[PDB]
Design a protein around this nucleic acid. Structure first.
Lengths: 86, 52, 122, 196, 50
RNA sequence: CGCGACCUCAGAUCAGACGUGGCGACCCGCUGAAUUUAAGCAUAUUAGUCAGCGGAGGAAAAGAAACUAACCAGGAUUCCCUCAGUAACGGCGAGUGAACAGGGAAGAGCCCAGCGCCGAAUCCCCGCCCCGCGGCGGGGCGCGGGAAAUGUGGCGUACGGAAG
RNA sequence: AAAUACCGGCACGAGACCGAUAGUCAACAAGUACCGUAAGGGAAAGUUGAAAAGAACUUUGAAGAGAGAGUUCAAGAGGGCG
RNA sequence: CCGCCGCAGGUGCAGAUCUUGGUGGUAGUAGCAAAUAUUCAAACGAGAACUUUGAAGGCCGAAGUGGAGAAGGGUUCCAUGUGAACAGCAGUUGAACAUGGGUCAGUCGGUCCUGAGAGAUGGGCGAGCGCCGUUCCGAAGGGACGGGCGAUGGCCUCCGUUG
RNA sequence: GAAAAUCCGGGGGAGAGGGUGUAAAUCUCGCGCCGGGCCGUACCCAUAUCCGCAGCAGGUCUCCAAGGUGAACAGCCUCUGG
RNA sequence: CGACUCUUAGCGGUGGAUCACUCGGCUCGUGCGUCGAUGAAGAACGCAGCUAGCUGCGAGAAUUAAUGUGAAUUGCAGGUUGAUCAUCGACACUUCGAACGCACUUGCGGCCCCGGGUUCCUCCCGGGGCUACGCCUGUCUGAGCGUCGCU
C-alpha cells in the first residue's frame, strides 16, 4: 500500500507562498522558506547552484530603480536643474 | 470599509444609505450593495447616475 | 477640449482643485457609459480625461514643491524629499570644502617646495 | 520533453562538442626577422620581371616600360580625379577596370559574417612621403598604399604568390637602395642586414 | 477550500483573469506571431500549484 | 538627613547622523573536503583547490625595509620577461617547487605616538544676522553650552630632530 | 596613487567562429509551458508573398470538406503555407 | 555558386541496448467483459441503442448511488449558444468550447485565548552565517489613587483637560 | 483524564454623599438613544469536480438515518430521495 | 486470367531532411566601472476603448511634465498654441521586501493633529504626521553602603 493507495491521504500542505520571493516553499511548521529563508535577513543563495542563482539575480525582475540609475549615470547623476525652456 | 462607501455614495449622489453589504467577487474586485434609505427612490436615482 | 500644462502653471491654487474634480466627475460619467455599453465616442474620450487628470495633479504636485524648496532653501536642515538624491555611496563622501582641508604642515611643505616648471638641454 | 533524453556526450542532441575549441589555441605564428626580409627580397625582385606579374594576373600589357616609377608630384595629390587620370596616362587603369569587373558576391557563410563582397587585388602604390597620396588613391578599388620603410609581405605578395604589379614614386624607389643595400654596401635603415 | 485566506483569493482571482483566449483583432496586427493563447490552463489538466 | 562636584552606569518616539540588504567576474580575511594520482594504500598528491562564512572597492590588497646581500654593493610596493621546472621538499616514490640578481611597465612619497616647548595656543554643537551653497560652507555674534591636563593644536619622526 | 585584475554590470567595436538536432537552457509570449511537497529539474518551437492581392460571386453538403471562378510570375506558394 | 594555387579545420558513418526527430510490420489485431437491466411512444433536430419528456420494468434500500460539511480543488457553480478538438462508440450531450452572469453577516466561522510547542530581547557560545536558552546571570512597571503653583474649553465658576 | 483568555460573587471598609430638601451621592431596575468596521461565504466532497499522469474497481475526516422479517446499524424486500 | 505480392518509374500523400537565408548566439578587444532606511535586488498585485501572454508602467498606472523631433498612432473604432517618437534633469513611484508600531490573520495597538458627529466636549467615522533594532556625538531626567565633599 506504499504507492497508489498512499497518494489518497495527501490533503494537508507543508509549503505555502513565501512573501519575499513569491516561491511556494515557505514551510508552515518550520516557518522558513526553502528558496530564500524568509525570517533570515540574508537571501539564501549557494554556489553549488549557479543555475538557481541566475533564476533570481538583478537580470530577472524589473530593476525599476536600478535601470533609472544606469540611465541617470550617463549624465553624472545631475539633480535639480531643468533644460532651458522656450 | 463599509463606512468609506457610506460617505462615497452620500458625497457623489446627494443620497443617504440604510446599510452597505460588500462582497469581493471571484474576479478580485469588491461589490457594495448600497441599500438606500426610503426618503429617496433607488430606480429614480439610477436615472441620475445614468444606468438602464 | 485640449487641456495643456502651460496655462495651468500660471493659475491660482484653489481653481486647479475645481478643474480637477470637474474632470473626476467627467471621468465618472464615462466609466458608467463603458459598463452600460453605449456611445463608442464616449470610450475614446476616457483616455483623454485620464491623462488630463495626470496633468492637473502634476501641476499641483510640481508647484507645491517649488514653493517648499523656495522657503526651505535658506535652512541648514531641509526635508529628505528636498535633499539631493545622488547615490547612497555618493552622499557618504566628504564635502567639497572637507576635501580642500590640507594640514597646517602640508600647507608648509607645499609652500617652501612648489613643484617647479623645468626642462633640460639634450 | 527533456526528462530522460540524453544530456552529455558529443553524439547527444543538445550536449557539448568533442574537444571544445579553446581561446588558448596557438593562434599566432612568429617568423624569423631574417626570413621576413628574405620574403620581401623575393617579392620586390619578382614584381619587375613582367612574366610573373602577368602570371599573377595584373593587366600590365600597355605599361609603357619599367618596374613603374612615377615623379614625386603623385605624393602631392589631394583628389581621386587627379589619381584616376594618373593611372589612365601610365595605362594601369585596365588593372582597376579588371578589379571593377571582379566585384562579385562571395560564396556561402562569408556573406552573413561581414565578408559579403570579394574583388581583385589591383596595382600597389609604394610612396616615400604623404602629402595626400593615400587620400587621393584609397577610394579607387584594388589600390593598396604601402610606405617604403614599412613594406608588408601580405600586400606585396597577396595570396602567398609573387608578382603584384607595384607602382613606385621616384623618392620611394631610391630608398630601397638604403633599406636593403646592395651585395657590397650594407643596409643603412637596418642595423645588421645584407641582401641574401 | 470554501475556507480561504484573502491573499490566496487574490492569487486565484489573477489566475482566472489570465485564463481567457486571445482577442480576434490581435493577429490582424503587422508583427503577427501569436496564433492562440499557449498559457491557457484547465482545472483537470494542470493544478495551478498550491 | 540634605544640597554640590565627580566616577561608573540606566532610561528616552530626546536633537542630529550613521550601520543592516543586494550584486559578487575580479579583490581581502577565515574555513576547508573527497573524487583523482601513487597502476593497491595510509604520508604525500588532488589542494590551502570545490563547497560553506564574513568584508569591500572602482579596482582591492600590498607599500616607502626590524630588505637584499657578501659585491667595486644595491634600495618601498605591484606587475611582466628571466632566473627555472632551477635551489629545495618528498613511502627522496608519485609528484611538488620558490627567491635574489638582472632586463622592463610605472615610479611618490610620507604621518603620528614617544621625547620636548608654547597662558588648550585645539575642537564639535546650538542660538542671531549676513552673501550664500541639489557635496551646509566662509565671515561676524554672544562672561551661550560641551570636549579636553586620564593630553587637543602647532613644531617634530630615524633620512635625524629641537633650541640659542 | 601609477603600472595590475575583471567568465558580473552599463554602452560599444570586431571575428579564417555557429547557422535552428548547430550556437547560450533560451534566434519565437524562455528560465516560458510543464514536473516535483520542497531543494531543484526545465523543454519543444525560425521561414506564405514583391505587395494580403489571405481565395468575391455561383453551386453540392447539416457542416467539415469540395467543384467552378478570382488574385499572383507562381497557390506546382492557400493562414505552422520557401 | 564554383574551378585552379596556397591556408585552416568541430572535415566523410551502418553499427555504439549511440542521441534527437519521423515512420513501418505486428494490425483494423489485443482490446472497449468488475458492482442485476433495460423497453415503448413522442418532441427538438440534417442526424438517435445513448439527449429530453411521459408510460412501463428495475437497482441503491436510511453504516444508501440520498441530503449536507471539513481537507483538497479554484469557477469546475448557473444560464445562453455552436457541437472543430477532448469526454477510448456515439451525441441535438457534458464537469469540453465560447460569450456572459453569480458568493451580501454585531449574531455563522476567521479574528481573541492558550495547548503540545514555536520563538525574540538580556545573557552565554560563536572564525562566522548565526546559534543556544525562554526566566535563566537583567535597573524587564511608562499604570493608577493622592497633594500646590501654572495653564487651556466653559460667566478660569470649577471640573473635564494638562505639566 | 488541559491550560489560558474571559466573566461573576464574596470578605474587607479607605472613601463619597446630602442636612431635611426642588434632597443628594449612587443603582447589576424598567424603558429610550447611538454604533458594530475587517476577511471567508458559489459549487464538488467522491465508482465523474480532491490525491493516485486519466470520468483510474485504489485511497481520503464527519452529521442526519423510514417500514417489514429479525437478537440485530446482520442479510434480503419496499417508501421519501437518487 | 484477375486477386494477392515483389521490382522500377511517373504522379499524389505522409514526414520535415537538404539547401538558401538570420533583428540570435558564442568568442575576443575596448571604454566605463553606478545599488540600498531619500526604502535596493527581488516578489506580489494592479493598470489599455476593445488586451490573455510579452514588454511599458504604478491609483497621475502601455504613463504626467520638460527639452528635442516636426505630422502621425494604426489591428479596428473614436477626436501647428505641436501629432508622434526619442531623450528625461521636474513630479510621481500601491503591497510585501534589510522592511521599520506589534503580528503575519493583513489581524490589533498607541500618541499628537485635523475634518464629519460639531460649533471643543467626550465616544464614533475618515484622513494625516509619528511610533523598528544596533550605534555615534551632544541633550535631558535619573541611579549607586563608587569616590569624596560642605553642614
Amino acid at each position: 500500500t506504499k504507492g497508489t493507495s498512499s497518494f489518497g491521504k495527501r490533503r494537508n500542505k507543508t509549503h505555502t507562498l513565501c512573501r519575499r520571493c513569491g516561491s511556494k516553499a515557505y514551510h508552515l511548521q518550520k516557518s522558513t522558506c526553502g528558496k530564500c529563508g524568509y525570517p533570515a535577513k540574508r537571501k539564501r543563495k549557494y554556489n553549488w547552484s549557479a543555475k538557481a542563482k541566475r533564476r533570481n539575480t538583478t537580470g530577472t525582475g524589473r530593476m525599476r530603480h536600478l535601470k533609472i540609475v544606469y540611465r541617470r549615470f550617463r549624465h553624472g547623476f545631475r539633480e535639480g536643474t531643468t533644460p532651458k525652456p522656450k | 470599509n463599509k463606512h468609506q462607501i457610506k460617505q462615497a455614495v452620500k458625497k457623489l449622489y446627494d443620497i443617504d444609505v440604510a446599510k452597505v453589504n460588500t462582497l469581493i467577487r471571484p474576479d478580485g474586485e469588491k461589490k457594495a450593495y448600497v441599500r438606500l434609505a426610503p426618503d429617496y427612490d433607488a430606480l429614480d436615482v439610477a436615472n441620475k447616475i445614468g444606468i438602464i | 477640449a485640449k487641456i495643456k500644462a502651460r496655462d495651468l502653471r500660471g493659475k491660482k491654487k484653489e481653481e486647479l482643485l475645481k478643474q480637477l474634480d470637474d474632470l473626476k466627475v467627467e471621468l465618472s460619467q464615462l466609466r458608467v457609459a463603458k459598463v452600460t455599453g453605449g456611445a463608442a465616442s464616449k470610450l475614446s474620450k476616457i483616455r483623454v480625461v485620464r491623462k488630463s487628470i495626470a496633468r492637473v495633479l502634476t501641476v499641483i504636485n510640481q508647484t507645491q514643491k517649488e514653493n517648499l524648496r523656495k522657503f526651505y532653501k535658506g535652512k541648514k536642515y531641509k526635508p529628505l524629499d528636498l535633499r539631493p538624491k545622488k547615490t547612497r555611496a555618493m552622499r557618504r563622501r566628504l564635502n567639497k570644502h572637507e576635501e580642500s582641508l590640507k594640514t597646517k604642515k602640508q600647507q608648509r611643505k607645499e609652500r617652501l617646495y612648489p613643484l617647479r616648471k623645468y626642462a633640460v638641454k639634450a | 520533453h527533456r526528462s530522460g533524453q540524453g544530456a552529455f556526450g558529443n553524439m547527444c542532441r543538445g550536449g557539448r562538442m568533442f574537444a571544445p575549441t579553446k581561446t588558448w589555441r596557438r593562434w599566432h605564428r612568429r617568423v624569423n626577422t631574417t626570413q621576413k626580409r628574405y620574403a620581401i627580397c623575393s617579392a620586390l625582385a619578382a614584381s619587375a620581371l613582367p612574366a610573373l606579374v602577368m602570371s599573377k594576373g595584373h593587366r600590365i600589357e600597355e605599361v609603357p616600360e619599367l618596374p613603374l616609377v612615377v615623379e614625386d608630384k603623385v605624393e602631392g595629390y589631394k583628389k581621386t580625379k587627379e589619381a584616376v587620370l594618373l593611372l589612365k596616362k601610365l595605362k594601369a587603369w585596365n588593372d582597376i577596370k579588371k578589379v571593377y569587373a571582379s566585384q562579385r558576391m562571395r560564396a556561402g557563410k562569408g556573406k552573413m559574417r561581414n565578408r559579403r563582397r570579394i574583388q581583385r587585388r589591383g596595382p600597389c602604390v609604394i610612396y616615400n612621403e604623404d602629402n595626400g597620396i593615400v587620400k587621393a588613391f584609397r577610394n579607387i578599388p584594388g589600390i593598396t598604399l604601402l610606405n617604403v620603410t614599412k613594406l608588408n609581405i601580405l600586400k606585396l605578395a597577396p595570396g602567398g604568390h609573387v608578382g603584384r604589379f607595384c607602382i613606385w614614386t621616384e623618392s620611394a624607389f631610391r630608398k630601397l637602395d638604403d633599406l636593403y643595400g646592395t651585395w657590397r654596401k650594407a643596409a643603412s635603415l637596418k642595423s645588421n642586414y645584407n641582401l641574401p | 477550500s470554501s475556507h480561504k485566506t484573502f491573499r490566496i483569493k487574490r492569487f486565484l482571482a489573477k489566475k482566472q483573469k489570465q485564463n481567457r483566449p486571445i482577442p480576434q483583432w490581435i493577429w490582424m496586427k503587422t508583427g503577427n506571431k501569436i496564433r492562440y493563447n499557449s498559457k491557457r490552463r484547465h482545472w483537470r489538466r494542470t493544478k495551478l500549484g498550491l
